[PDB]
Amino acid sequence: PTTKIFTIIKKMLQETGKNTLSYENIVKTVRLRGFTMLQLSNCIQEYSYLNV
Amino acid sequence: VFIFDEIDTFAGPVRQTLLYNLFDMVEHSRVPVCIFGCTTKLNILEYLEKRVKSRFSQRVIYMPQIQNLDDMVDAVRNLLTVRSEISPWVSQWNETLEKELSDPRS
């Protein structure tokens, strides 16, 4: 449930390759799929351990 | 092909010379080699120091275990069953094996 969402981030990282800290246009492709705002909020903090 | 049994004991603290030469033979030699470390110390990678681990191609493979009760039951069936025809007893012998094995109360 979290292996896919790294690759849509990689689709953004394909586009501009930006590691921004706070988001307004990363979250815009998530709400149309089916997951809430809280699941991605954890995905911000846990992928900080990946240093990405 | 290199076959190394108990490569952890070569990975001592003091010198580690012999590991350092074969792992650099990966990097430079035109002679195609392959190294096969076999051990049982699990965290083998922390036992190495820095300059040897950077020579190492980092790929380890863990060996499986019998994870379910059914697995070794399947193993002993393949273990004891003869498939080639040698004896007249064989066809009688093969069905006696599984009949003990199929019954969970046997």
């Binding site: 954890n42 903090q45 900080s48 351990y49 240093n51 | 603290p13 922390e46």
Partner: protein, 373 residues
């Protein structure tokens, strides 16, 4: 522009004036003064005596005075073998170079009765050899004994780094015996005798060496902790290639390599905010000042992260990689220390080069480590 600075990198000293007084009987063929020449290290002192004897041998009468380097012996025999090498002869060598009394037979010359003085180079390898009062002090004792009756005496000139060696002498030897007394020292030349030799070592002078007051500035602000100004010109010879590479500028380049991460570039090492969290996690485990394993750190890492839920608890394998990010910058070092249960078994104890004063500044800017402190 190369050949002027190609030649840049290569009687003369005001210490040679001392030793001719100390060798006042060496031109009258008598036994000279009593020579134990010491020095703080790097002070030119190895080549200092080598400057004297090479000026002695090129000046000087039958001429045979030899000098050998005591490095690879650990044992007092083959020194007395190497004095035989100036003879180019053949004999029974082993017994004559071994015992104290065996050296005495060796001191009867052959051709014209010119006295011999030996030079013992780098005596501190035998001083700081095997245990003192057993072999090495006895070796020191046996060499300095010059009670021979003719004036043909094996005058020692030995050299040492650290100045404890005189108090190491026995009270009989300190009763004005042998080559003892003249403990000629060499204080490290600040700029007042060494720089002027560099001036005369600029006999072939290019036009733009540089502003020599900056060279004087180089000498004054290197003389805090130094002994070798040609080698500290060999750091000018590297910066003189910097002005060739770009077609005390370099001491400024080299100290910022060493001073930084504690003041500024600590946060450079921890761009990850979790790397900031794991760095405080190490210091919280340092309360139990023990063999700080990667597991006991992982113990305090889990039991705090279950209380304050700043992040999810990560893997031990992740905990292995993240502390190595702390390692390669040079903050924390890891060593395989001692635990002696079954064999010499190696658990990994860490050590941090940061203080809580240089910690508390960089954490009050981030209130997410403030639950953890």
């Amino acid at each position: 522009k190369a050949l002027l600075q190609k030649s840049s990198e290569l009687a003369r000293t005001a210490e040679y004036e001392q030793v001719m007084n100390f060798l006042a009987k060496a031109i009258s063929e008598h036994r000279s003064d009593s020579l134990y020449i010491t020095g703080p290290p790097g002070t030119g002192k190895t080549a200092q005596l080598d400057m004297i004897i090479r000026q002695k041998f090129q000046s000087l009468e039958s001429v045979a005075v030899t000098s050998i380097n005591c490095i690879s012996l650990g044992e007092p025999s083959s020194i007395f073998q190497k004095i035989f090498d100036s003879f180019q002869d053949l004999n029974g060598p082993t017994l004559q170079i071994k015992n104290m009394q065996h050296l005495q037979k060796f001191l009867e010359p052959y051709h014209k009765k010119t006295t011999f003085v030996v030079v013992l180079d780098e005596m501190d390898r035998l001083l700081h050899a095997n245990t003192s009062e057993t072999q090495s002090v006895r070796t020191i004792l046996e060499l300095f004994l010059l009670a021979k009756l003719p004036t043909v005496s094996f005058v020692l000139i030995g050299m040492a780094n650290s100045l404890d060696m005189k108090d190491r002498f026995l009270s009989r030897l300190n009763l004005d015996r042998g080559l003892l007394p003249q403990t000629i020292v060499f204080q490290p030349y600040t700029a007042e005798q060494m720089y002027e030799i560099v001036i005369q070592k600029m006999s072939s002078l290019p036009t733009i060496i540089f502003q020599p007051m900056a060279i004087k500035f180089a000498a004054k602000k290197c003389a805090g902790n130094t002994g070798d100004l040609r080698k500290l010109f060999d750091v000018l010879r590297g910066s003189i290639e910097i002005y060739e590479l770009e077609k005390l500028n370099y001491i400024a380049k080299v100290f910022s390599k060493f001073v930084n991460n504690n003041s500024t570039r600590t946060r450079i090492a921890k761009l990850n905010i979790q790397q900031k969290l794991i760095l405080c996690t190490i210091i919280q485990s340092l309360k139990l000042n023990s063999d700080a394993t990667i597991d006991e750190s992982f113990d305090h890492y889990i039991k705090a992260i279950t209380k304050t839920d700043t992040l999810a608890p990560l893997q031990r394998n992740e905990f292995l990689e993240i502390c190595t990010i702390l390692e390669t910058c040079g903050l924390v070092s890891i060593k395989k220390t001692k635990c002696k249960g079954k064999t010499k078994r190696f658990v990994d104890k860490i050590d941090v080069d940061l203080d809580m004063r240089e910690f508390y500044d960089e954490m009050t800017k981030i209130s997410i480590l403030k639950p953890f402190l």
